[PDB]
């Protein structure tokens, strides 16, 4: 089978190897902060967000995800958008107190950012549906109440810039995903809370928060 | 197909422990964990590529544990049933960048997770290693011994590490865990030749090249 019974972009979470996330993109450094999630962070719509046992302060971060359509090694910024298959709406689910400890102790962010279900993900949005990734409204509601809204025009580092920089450090494979940061309004969730989030005019998704 | 013999071709995730050897310093706190991407794999035949930004590249010879099976919250007593086998690995580290990451309280990504940051030997089936904690690892640079140590010097056992990791991160078929480096970590420069092995089991050669 030489088809999309092999690498279907509509199911990128099933076969995608790597997830790369930018830090503060809405002190900021000369470059975007980068951290990884494992493939097993993916929570496709229908999956709950799982509060880890060790987690006291679970935070939502609505983020635009950029899906790579082809292998990219030191991708030029001017070519970067030729490497994009499309987008997903994502949550960068964060154990915020663990993260405070990680920052303070100079440890890796893995227990804060990389747990099971730490990357809820919408249906695949083909590139065609988004003329301009930097002209979108991201929104997130908890129990029907708006908590984050932000414009992707507010991004400090552009998506072509991010793809380029990341690919110079980490070769990206077909189906790798880059989370491009969260606007203002990040905040906590508790067991049995309902998250709704969307990109205006493009896609919405629902997640319930549960425990292990 | 997805042969475990070629796990680097298709494996999704690499998890690495911090310091797990009691034979050097460069109520026990849990093991530090960090991730490498799939594109960290440098299978034998690949060179190690020094990132442009790197001033102080370090070798870390490590025993890699390959998972055969999906595992969530694996009990320590069951952990070894999830192991398909082993690989000899290098946890290639930009040491100065790591100091910068620690100082700012940022992720260790640029220090630990670059392209080719995980050189990897031929797959060793579990059968060939009755006791993972009774192995000698060694590494030479340009013919000169730099690291040697026993996996009996590990602070946390392999079943412990698999268990702890799986409670935080579900492991897939083909995921790899690097279990730490013995004494002798140190720098390597462009055009250095690395030889490393597990006594009685496997050896590997790598050349270090630049951008
Ligand atoms: Cl927390
Ligand atoms: Cl360095
Ligand atoms: Cl990290
Ligand atoms: Mg984030
Ligand atoms: Mg991965
Ligand atoms: Mg190591």
From Swiss-Prot, chain A:
Binding site for oxalate: 24, 113
Catalytic activity: oxaloacetate = enol-oxaloacetate; oxaloacetate + H(+) = pyruvate + CO2; a 3-acylpyruvate + H2O = a carboxylate + pyruvate + H(+); acetylpyruvate + H2O = acetate + pyruvate + H(+)
Keywords linked to the UniProt accession: Acetylation, Cytoplasm, Hydrolase, Isomerase, Lyase, Magnesium, Manganese, Metal-binding, Mitochondrion, Phosphoprotein, Transit peptide
Regulation of its activity: Oxaloacetate decarboxylation is potently and competitively inhibited by oxalate.
Transit peptide: 3-26
Binding positions (Mg(2+)): 61, 63, 92
Gene Ontology cellular-component terms listed: cytosol; mitochondrial inner membrane; mitochondrial matrix; mitochondrion; nucleoplasm
Compartments, record wording: Mitochondrion; Cytoplasm, Cytosol
Enzyme Commission (EC) number: 5.3.2.2, 3.7.1.5, 4.1.1.112
Cofactor binding note: Requires a divalent metal cation for activity.
The family this protein is said to belong to: Belongs to the FAH family.
Assembly mode: Homodimer.
Name of this protein: Oxaloacetate tautomerase FAHD1, mitochondrial
Organism: Mus musculus (Mouse)
Swiss-Prot record, chain B:
Binding site for oxalate: 19, 112
Principal location class: mitochondrion
Activity control summary: Oxaloacetate decarboxylation is potently and competitively inhibited by oxalate.
InterPro entries, sorted: Fumarylacetoacetase-like_C, Fumarylacetoacetase_C_sf
Protein's organism: Mus musculus
Catalytic activity, EC: 5.3.2.2, 3.7.1.5, 4.1.1.112
PANTHER family: ACYLPYRUVASE, ACYLPYRUVASE FAHD1, MITOCHONDRIAL
Free-text tissue specificity from the UniProt record: Ubiquitous with higher expression in the liver and the kidney (at protein level).
GO BP: oxaloacetate metabolic process; pyruvate metabolic process
Catalytic activity: oxaloacetate = enol-oxaloacetate; oxaloacetate + H(+) = pyruvate + CO2; a 3-acylpyruvate + H2O = a carboxylate + pyruvate + H(+); acetylpyruvate + H2O = acetate + pyruvate + H(+)
GO cellular component: cytosol; mitochondrial inner membrane; mitochondrial matrix; mitochondrion; nucleoplasm
Cofactor: Mg(2+); Mn(2+)
Gene inactivation effect: Elevated oxaloacetate levels. No other visible phenotype.
Keywords for the protein's UniProt record, in alphabetical order: Acetylation, Cytoplasm, Hydrolase, Isomerase, Lyase, Magnesium, Manganese, Metal-binding, Mitochondrion, Phosphoprotein, Transit peptide
Subunit-structure text: Homodimer.
Name of the protein: Oxaloacetate tautomerase FAHD1, mitochondrial
Entry's Gene Ontology molecular function annotations: acetylpyruvate hydrolase activity; acylpyruvate hydrolase activity; fumarylpyruvate hydrolase activity; metal ion binding; oxaloacetate decarboxylase activity; oxaloacetate tautomerase activity
Transit peptide: 1-21
Cofactor note: Requires a divalent metal cation for activity.
Compartments where located: Mitochondrion; Cytoplasm, Cytosol
TM annotation in the entry: none
